[PDB]
Amino acid sequence: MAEDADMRNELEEMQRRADQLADESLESTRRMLQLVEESKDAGIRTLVM
């Protein structure tokens, strides 16, 4: 023998959707963080008045 082979190889990235399209769902989850609180804001002060 007298054999030394030490080797390397390269990676295959699984198609993780591979587009920005993920953002739109992320935009919906923005808005549900965003547009919800003022309901309570005006709710508690509607209840004050």
Binding site: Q15, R16, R17, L21, E24, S25, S28, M32
Partner: peptide, 15 residues
């Protein structure tokens, strides 16, 4: 691996 994203879009925009 995209239909659940479409639900993540759709069910949550519905929400």
């Amino acid at each position: 691996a995209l239909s659940e994203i479409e639900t993540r879009h759709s069910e949550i925009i519905k929400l």
